[PDB]
Nucleic acid binder design. Structure first.
Length: 48
DNA sequence: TAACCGCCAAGGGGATTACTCCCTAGTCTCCAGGCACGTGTTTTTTTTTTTTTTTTTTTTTTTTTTTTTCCTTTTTTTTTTTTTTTT
């Protein structure tokens, strides 16, 4: 994301920190567990 | 302008007297509708059982198998020990 430490880093900088340059991210780390948030369908509010 | 009065003339019908007659007053005598008493059969009221729809409750949702993850309380009041200040 923008506010994380892996923001706009190069492949060499990600590799030196033992991170995958091909990793897209998109997940939280909660207690060492990778958690992903699923988008939920809902009705369109304020619609007749 | 004809009401009213005076004068005169004419006639029409209610009052009067008598005769008649006939319809009702009165009195028996028989009998029958008018009336006093009893009651009814429809009319209203009340129960009674059902009917019919609405509402609520309750129970249900194919089976078997294999991996992770999180949690398996928590704040809030009461108690009890400790520390500091004062005479």
């Amino acid at each position: 994301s923008t506010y994380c430490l892996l923001s706009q880093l190069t492949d060499r900088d990600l590799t030196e920190l033992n991170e995958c340059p091909l990793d897209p991210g998109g997940y939280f780390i909660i207690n060492g567990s990778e958690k992903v948030l699923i988008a939920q369908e809902k009705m369109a509010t304020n619609t007749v």
